[PDB]
């Protein structure tokens, strides 16, 4: 399990995380992938967390896309990615509450 | 008390009479000796104070029966002393003049204190009160941080 990722997703760590989730309510919304279809999330806190995560992602995307080699295609691709992120964020701002 | 290990003989004559009085104390002690999650410094201190008081009280009871009331045999008293029940030094202090009402020994360790003196408890309420009156303020101290002893003095 060299290079840290393996360590992170080693069974023991996972178990610990699960335990934390069970007792006290420590989740790491960084750690899990954000769900595709909203309205399968009855809790508000979770939703908020997800929204926050997406915002963070968007910010990250923004930070990188103004790099100096602007003509490279990665940046262009991200522009679409950025849009997608924005859309997701908007969706997360649903009007149930 | 310590634990019996056939070192000293089980007990002298009149222990059966007093035992039920000083066995109430044990229960109290047990209640005291544990995690009262005090969550607060003052509260924590209070339990210690209570414990100290309890310790004092048993000794006083013993002392009272042996010296003042004199209803218990010398041998029995000696045995008690040998055991952890009574405090020997405390008893001695009590027996001496000016120390009869005495919360605990470490309230008269002059070495201990930051200012080279005894605990305030040892000041008779009278004097402190008088001082307060002279000043303008009301009665200043309630109980010391060693042991809860509102007006320990012999007065």
């Amino acid at each position: 399990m060299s290079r840290n990722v393996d360590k992170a997703n080693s069974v023991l760590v996972r178990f610990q995380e699960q335990q934390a989730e069970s007792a006290g309510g420590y989740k790491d919304y960084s750690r899990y992938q954000r769900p595709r279809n909203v309205s399968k999330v009855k809790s508000i806190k979770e939703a908020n967390e997800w929204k926050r995560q997406v915002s963070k992602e968007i910010k990250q995307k923004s930070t990188r896309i103004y790099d100096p080699s602007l003509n490279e295609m990665q940046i262009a691709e991200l522009n679409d990615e950025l849009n997608n992120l924005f859309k997701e964020w908007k969706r997360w701002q649903w009007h149930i509450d | 008390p310590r634990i019996k290990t056939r070192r000293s003989k089980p007990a002298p004559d009149g222990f059966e009479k007093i035992k039920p009085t000083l066995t109430d104390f044990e229960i109290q002690l047990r209640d005291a000796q544990k995690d009262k999650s005090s969550k607060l410094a003052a509260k924590s201190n209070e339990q210690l104070w209570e414990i100290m008081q309890l310790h004092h009280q048993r000794s006083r009871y013993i002392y009272t029966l042996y010296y003042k009331r004199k209803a218990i045999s010398k041998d029995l008293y000696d045995w008690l002393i040998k055991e952890k029940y009574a405090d020997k030094l405390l008893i001695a202090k009590w027996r001496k003049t000016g120390y009869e009402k005495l919360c605990c020994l470490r309230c008269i360790q002059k070495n201990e204190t930051n200012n080279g003196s005894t605990c305030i408890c040892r000041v008779p309420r009278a004097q402190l009160e008088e001082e307060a009156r002279k000043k303008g303020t009301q009665v200043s101290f309630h109980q010391c941080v060693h042991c809860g002893c509102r007006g320990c003095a012999s007065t």
């Binding site: 610990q16 995380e17 335990q19 934390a20 007792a23 006290g24 309510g25 420590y26 989740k27 790491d28 919304y29 960084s30 967390e49 | 005090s38 969550k39 607060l40 003052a42 509260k43 303020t137 009301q138 009665v139 200043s140 101290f141 309630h142």
Partner: protein, 252 residues
């Protein structure tokens, strides 16, 4: 009139004063009392208690002995010592302020060292360099559980909470910034107010979201970074001048 109003206080009994931390992290660090191996959680949670001062405020073990400093816990609204507390339980009156006005430079009305530099977030116990009586209120959205209220209503609510807590100089709610500036007469009073209203809900019993006030995040009450718009500045300057004049008079 706190003296003749009551003696007793007993705000939150020592059975239930507080649980110790709130689980961020995986493991609990014994030395810092803070959860470790992770940081996910906005952390600020609403006070379970509050200072309803008219009910609570009272004589203390401190009052009799001649304590200067007021009870932080009382302010927060959770002083389990109550009448046997050594710190004072009332809203800082003028006389009291006057009495501890010598010390009020170095340390707060709670008897705890004011710092030389402000905290970067203006978040707690103000600096001794800059005297202040002026509190930033914030997180009013969060403190009201995202309620669609009128700004005016919010302002009124703020006034109600803060007037009770101390002699007000002046208050401003702002729609654009989404905040509530308050200014007091006495720094001590301001400090007390801050202590009280840290992590407090602005909601009332009559509101429909009273039972879920705990689930939100409380008021973010902090110190005021001075207002830049010019009239205010001018006023401040004038005040300073007046103060200087007073000082001069005292001297001569």
């Amino acid at each position: 009139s706190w003296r003749d109003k009551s003696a007793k206080v007993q705000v939150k009994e020592s059975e239930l004063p507080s649980s110790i931390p709130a689980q961020t992290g995986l493991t609990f660090n014994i030395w810092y009392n803070k959860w470790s191996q992770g940081f996910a959680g906005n952390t600020r949670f609403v006070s379970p208690f509050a200072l309803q001062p008219q009910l609570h405020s009272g004589k203390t073990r401190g009052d009799n002995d001649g304590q200067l400093f007021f009870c932080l816990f009382f302010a927060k609204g959770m002083c389990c010592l109550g009448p046997k507390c050594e710190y004072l339980h009332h809203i800082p009156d003028e006389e009291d302020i006057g009495k501890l006005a010598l010390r009020t430079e170095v340390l707060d009305c709670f008897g705890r060292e004011k710092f030389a530099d402000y905290r970067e977030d203006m978040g707690g116990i103000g600096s001794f360099r800059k005297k202040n009586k002026t509190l930033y209120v914030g997180g009013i959205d969060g403190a009201l559980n995202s309620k669609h209220l009128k700004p005016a209503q919010i302002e009124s609510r703020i006034r109600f909470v803060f007037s009770r807590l101390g002699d007000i100089d002046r208050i401003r709610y702002v729609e654009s910034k989404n905040c509530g500036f308050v200014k007091f007469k006495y720094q001590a009073n301001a400090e007390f107010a801050k202590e009280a209203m840290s992590n407090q809900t602005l909601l009332l019993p009559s509101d429909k979201e009273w039972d879920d006030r705990r689930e939100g995040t409380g008021l973010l009450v902090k110190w005021a970074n001075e207002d830049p718009d010019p009239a205010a500045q001018k006023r401040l300057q004038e005040e300073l001048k007046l103060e200087s004049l007073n000082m001069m008079v005292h001297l001569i």
